[PDB]
């Protein structure tokens, strides 16, 4: 049973990647 974590877009905690449109899933976001 997968669990869902929630986040807010704020550098350097959660930021969009440069090629995020190509990537999918947890690889879309990077940060602390």
């Amino acid at each position: 049973k997968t669990v869902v974590v929630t986040t807010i877009l704020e550098s350097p905690y959660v930021m969009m990647k440069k090629n995020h449109e190509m990537l999918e899933g947890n690889e879309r976001y990077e940060g602390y």
Partner: protein, 46 residues
Amino acid sequence: IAIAPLTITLVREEVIDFSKPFMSLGISIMIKKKPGVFSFLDPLAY
């Protein structure tokens, strides 16, 4: 579960549980941060 910069406050603690803080912070001050070649003439006006 929320893993984000969520400040630990009483109004949030009374309705949801908070783990021990992983990063401490506080209010801090942010401020904006060479002599001329002929600067020995400065003590007297031109």
